[PDB]
């Protein structure tokens, strides 16, 4: 099957939630640029996002990063753009 699906499943309170995380992670993965795991040993061939989550670095919360005023998820978007060089359309 897929690598460490069980461990992934354990990582989250709700099954359906894990899917949301990976999906959102995949979204950013393309748009902003690329990911946290790379140089030493990452995937091989051409491949995808769960490999990261299996790892410790990512953080998925109900409302991890937002803004003080108004519900703006957007502040996260701005910082990411500033930081990630590769650009999408």
């Amino acid at each position: 099957a897929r690598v460490t699906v069980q461990d992934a499943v354990e990582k989250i309170g709700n099954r359906f939630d894990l899917v949301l995380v990976a999906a959102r992670r995949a979204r950013q993965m393309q748009v902003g640029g690329k990911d946290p795991l790379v140089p030493e040993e990452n995937d091989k061939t051409t491949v995808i996002a769960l490999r990261e989550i299996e790892e410790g670095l990512i953080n998925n919360q109900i409302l991890d990063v937002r803004e003080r005023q108004e519900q703006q998820e957007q502040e996260a978007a701005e910082l990411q753009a500033v930081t990630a060089i590769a650009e999408g359309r």
């Binding site: 099957a1 897929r2 061939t45 051409t46 491949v47 995808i48």
Partner: protein, 101 residues
Amino acid sequence: SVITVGPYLRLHQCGLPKKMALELFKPFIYGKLELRGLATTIKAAKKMVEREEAVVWDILDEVIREHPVLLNRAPTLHRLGIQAFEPVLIEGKAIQLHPLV
């Protein structure tokens, strides 16, 4: 298309025809042609990969790396009527279905 058995085929993958992938998977081809030297622009690529072409065999397989599909039988009773599998370019016309499935 007609179904068949896929021994070496695992529950993670499925054995679908190669010619069939030329049609349904065309949208994912265009956005991968402009990266190589197969096609130049999106417009001029709509009159080449739209039919019988053998230059697409490679580029197409590069897209089916991590994009599973959904198999389905007409008489769909329970939930397992529509499952997901990793497409695999197999010669012929029949589709390979996992024995256990």
